[PDB]
Amino acid sequence: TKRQAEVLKKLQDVIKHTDRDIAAGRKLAIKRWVETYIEYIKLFKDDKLEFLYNVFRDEGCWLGTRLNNTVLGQKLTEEEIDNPLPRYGMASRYCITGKIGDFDFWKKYDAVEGFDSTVKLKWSEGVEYFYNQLEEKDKEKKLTEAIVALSRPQSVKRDAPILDFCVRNIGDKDTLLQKLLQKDKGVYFLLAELIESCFFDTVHDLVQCWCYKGVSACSDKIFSQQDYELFLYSLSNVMLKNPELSVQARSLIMEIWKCERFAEYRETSVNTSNYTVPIKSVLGGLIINWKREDVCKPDREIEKEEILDMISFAKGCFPEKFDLFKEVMIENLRICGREGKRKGVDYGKFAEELFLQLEK
């Protein structure tokens, strides 16, 4: 495990891109990659790890924050330094049927069967190949089916990369929303799974089409109060877990929270009752992220403003309950014990300070 962990860090410290977010996205992609192929690389040494460097420092392999599997597979089949990885193991894993490594699943399969089987196997490189071999008519239907199947409660992290791929290849996200709404909380599970794996871009696209595109939405709210509140709580946890992607997580928090379609939900989230308020984790999450000192963070002022405006919004909706709101938040920040929180510092004081500024 220590060895496995070392492997992960070394492979991530080579990625460098001008945009911090793109890089961080890639460090995550590498993590996911290493998760899939850990056994192959388990026993390894630095010298053998340089082959993984020339293919990972090559921007050809990278398509945005994600990896171009086709290119990557080709690079994983060339025996400069030796491929310590087996060509056959990799070729099969990357569905390179032709140019089979030669000297498991991989026979010959029709497209639909392969698609339906690869998804069951949670084989991200498998679903992609078959998607290509699919008839154009059948494409959207097959993808939609996969999404519905994989947007399920008892899910796993592997499902998210496939879900990401399916959403990005859906050419009509309006019908997708509709086929998802038939499933119980099928829309929540799709967004929550993409959030946990930090596929923020995909979520933004979905939020823009499903919440911001039109005056119309048969329930006007695609999400419920619970799903709305859970989205924000889950986003605040990921933001504290991935401080380099906090800008993208903060923008998603604001877009969901301040959406006009969910304005009633926004007012309910700041209603303090029974010594609790649903925005506690989220408002506490932004405060902790704003006071982080282990990262060089530009625009801490913008972050402070969001916090202040969220506090001001709570005062404007229920002015009578504001002192209750202040006491609940201060007490929550003193016992929270969440990630990114510096131990031994009283975060309650920071809140008290924000409350005073508001008074003036």
Residue numbers in the entry: 5 to 83, 87 to 110, 155 to 157, 166 to 276, 280 to 422
Question: What's in the article?
Answer:
Cytoplasmic incompatibility (CI) results when Wolbachia bacteria-infected male insects mate with uninfected females, leading to embryonic lethality. CI is caused by linked pairs of Wolbachia genes called CI factors (CifA and CifB). Protein-binding experiments and expression of cif genes in yeast have shown that CifA binds its cognate CifB specifically and rescues CifB-induced yeast growth defects. CidBwMel consists of a region, which is predicted to contain two PD-(D/E)XK (pseudo) nuclease domains (residue 1-751; hereafter CidBwMelND1-ND2, ND: nuclease domain) and a C-terminal deubiquitylase (DUB) domain.
We determined the crystal structure of CidAwMel to 2.75 Å resolution. CidAwMel is made up largely of α-helices. Residues 111-154 and 158-165 are disordered and cannot be modeled, which divide CidAwMel into an N-terminal domain (NTD, residues 1 to 161) (see below for why we include these disordered residues as part of the N-terminal domain) and a C-terminal domain (CTD, residues 162 to 422). Interestingly, the region of CidAwMel which is disordered in the absence of CidBwMel (residue 111-154 and 158-165) is modeled to form a helix bundle upon complex formation, consistent with its role in mediating CidAwMel-CidBwMelND1-ND2 interaction. These residues are part of the N-terminal domain.
